[PDB]
Symmetry: C4
Subunit: 267 residues, 4 copies
């Protein structure tokens, strides 16, 4: 039966490399969101019975590792518009793929929310008694997108994502640096996956350590059309744009931090 | 004394390769079930005193790694009829070993339940006061097999295992792909073990993330003969066939997902 | 100042290899017990405030990895009389070092208890109000040695350690097998450290997953002389000999299990 | 745009190697403190809702791994004056960089506290109602620096840090030993990161497993100027000097322990 599989492989073969990389980013971000947002639903819908916040940190951290193992060889497994912006800002990848990856990263993250919604369709609907509440004691929209806590304000929420994304790029840039290799080559999947693991355990209290415009805006746009309504965007004094603008500004901020102390003074 | 050991080794040497691989699968699935179902008994019989659900996720995830380290070099450490079905569907392994591995995977998983039952013989019997209850406040059958929760329905339970198994095959296929190696070769034990770790932390709320017909039907058949009675099969509106049919359909579904976006468009 | 260090190194150089390996086993078991029994004191004296049972599993599992990294190159990091008995039974190491390693493993484990006692000297004494209680609500002897639970009986306690040690040897033998290498060579520290991690999360409910005569009898003998009295040995219907006799019988039982299915039918 | 980046790289290039290593230590300790002290604020300000003590252990343990991945190739990622003192005492690194690294390690740790303070500015101020309390039910100074518990005394606190640092150097020396390599070269980031993980789970109950004069005195000096006042230094019967003097004495104590049993008797 290998003759049919090889025949199907040659027909479905994609000549365009750019579209091949965008297809890998859709599945790479799908795994990250399905295994990440699905973990939140496991600890929110169960009210902590099936795990606490450490379950979210372990699943979100190791979902990046698995997403890198899946789409790393094809597209580089950027998995983040802030990460893609950092690579483009460093003259490492063409600027033409910045909107291509972002469009391919928002998708898949949007699809990953639909998979999580279909995975917990009965639990989500029975959480608030055949109704959808954006936030509160029976809030269900917090599973997909990230929302500020009661203590968090508008100014602190901006710097919460800025520091989270800057610390992500600083650690990511050191891993992907060709001249900075304190670890044998090929272990970039586990090392980058540890960065998201310690970010959730350190800066995941204010909002939910989004630090990813695709991971946040993607499922947030899904919840608007799924039935949560327009209240998703207006929650937290129009919080929806904070996990988008701030991580982009945090990427260039984290690019400068690494380059000024270690990146430029190497070799 | 090495002369006797070498003499015993040559006598016990098995010429048939297929039977050698089936013998490895029996011990490979035995370790997976003994260390997996034993973890559930540690957190169910102790009522959360000796660990929560994160204990189950860590033990189930790392039991696959140890089972791969034990039987990986001999049989490939399929450890799953859905995984074996995916390999056969991809023209990677002969179809003759699909029933051979499944028979060898149900066994060992059945034996692994007996080892767990003998490990917690006093705790299981004293859990309900010298009696066996399939489900409820003193339910003991949920340690071995997986049962749906109160919120889970018949339709959602089918798609809960379908999504769990499809996400397992997608991540497994990327690891075992000869042309998709973002990680140095030989680390397949740890990478696959992380897939089960994040599946339990993401989709382990609805039923218990079976995603393995051998890991579910094996000990479930043990509980029927151990003393739990025929109520094990009739619990949850005849739930016993869901962790069997759905993961098989989820394997081919997950095979298509990986091949269409990354698998076919490689090299 | 390197001249003095090199001069001191040549003077202190040990010609005897057997005594060099015994010295490594004393420090190897010291790290395992200090980081293992110290973890129990962190969650028992704090009444779960500074960690649950998962803290014990992670610390005990990763203490074996660090002890292997410290004494692996010198003595092989057996760290267990049952493991040493398995190697001697397999004609891999001389029988002369079976009592030498056991004497060197009981020591260090005894010293590791003294370090833990001095680490938590104030917490241990203030736990019961300037008194030492072997077991109960204010029990402090359970930190060092392992004691059966209320549900555990004499017969089940024997098979609890037998299954725990047999599963340890089966996974250890597959790692140290020269012809069974599904993982790149040199990762034996992390792979063996995962075996103890999943044993604590699976079979650590009945008694405390001793599965190590040196790790159990060592600090238990320390508690008798530290002030706990002879009640340590008579607790649990003379439980002290169960974590000694059973793991030794479980090592040869686990040796046969691996050899009959995978060990003999290799290459 | 690569022409501008290369032009900027040559201008910003640093000729002095010693200043290049000090710049790496500032960012290396910054990551360790930002991801370490930020984890404490995640579990203290949330009152355990967003994680327990295991969150601190995982974040502190893996922050050393990420800090080594960032500054390991440049300065060696000492990250600890006790570690730097151990290297200088072993005639491995020049004594001239002992005050240079310590000054560069206190900084960054001081800056890491400011980043954590700005990350949780609203949560810290709202924790005690627009006020700063050093210790108590609303204590906020314990996030940055380490303070003794109620049971801990002056004598035990000295030996709590002595044992913690000695066990750290013993495990660190075995990893960085050129002649003691039971693990493939290059995995020093993960192996050292496991040492801090098991130290927090074993000896992190008495004070908070400081075992690092830079990680403790750095943010402690920040809290004095941030608004906590001079009570930070006088808390716990002048505890501030214990995490400074004791780890330095524990480094040479741990140097002797490893050298006498394994270090000297090698090759």
């Amino acid at each position: 039966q290998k003759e049919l599989m090889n025949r199907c492989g040659e027909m479905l073969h994609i000549r365009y490399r750019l579209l091949r990389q965008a297809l890998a980013e859709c599945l790479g971000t799908l795994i990250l969101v399905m295994f990440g947002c699905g973990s939140v639903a496991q600890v929110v819908l169960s009210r902590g019975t099936h795990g606490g916040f450490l379950t979210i940190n372990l699943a979100f951290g190791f979902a990046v590792t698995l997403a890198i193992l899946v789409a790393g060889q094809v597209s580089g497994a950027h998995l983040n518009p802030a990460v893609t912006f950092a690579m483009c800002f460093l003259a490492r990848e063409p600027w033409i793929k910045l909107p291509i990856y972002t469009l391919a990263q928002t998708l898949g993250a949007f699809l990953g929310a639909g998979i999580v919604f279909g995975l917990y369709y009965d639990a989500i609907w029975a959480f608030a008694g055949n109704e959808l509440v954006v936030s509160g004691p029976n809030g269900t929209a917090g599973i997909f997108a990230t929302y500020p806590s009661g203590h968090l304000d508008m100014v602190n929420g901006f710097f919460d994502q800025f520091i989270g994304t800057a610390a992500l790029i600083v650690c990511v840039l050191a891993i992907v640096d060709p001249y900075n290799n304190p670890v044998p080559r090929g272990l970039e999947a586990f090392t980058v996956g540890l960065v998201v693991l310690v970010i959730g355990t350190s800066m995941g209290f204010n909002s939910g350590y989004a630090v990813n415009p695709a991971r946040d805006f993607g499922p947030r746009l899904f919840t608007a059309l799924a039935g949560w309504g327009s209240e998703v965007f207006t929650t937290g004094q129009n919080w929806w744009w904070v996990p988008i603008v701030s991580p982009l500004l945090g990427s260039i901020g984290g690019v400068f931090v690494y380059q000024l102390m270690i990146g430029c003074h190497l070799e």
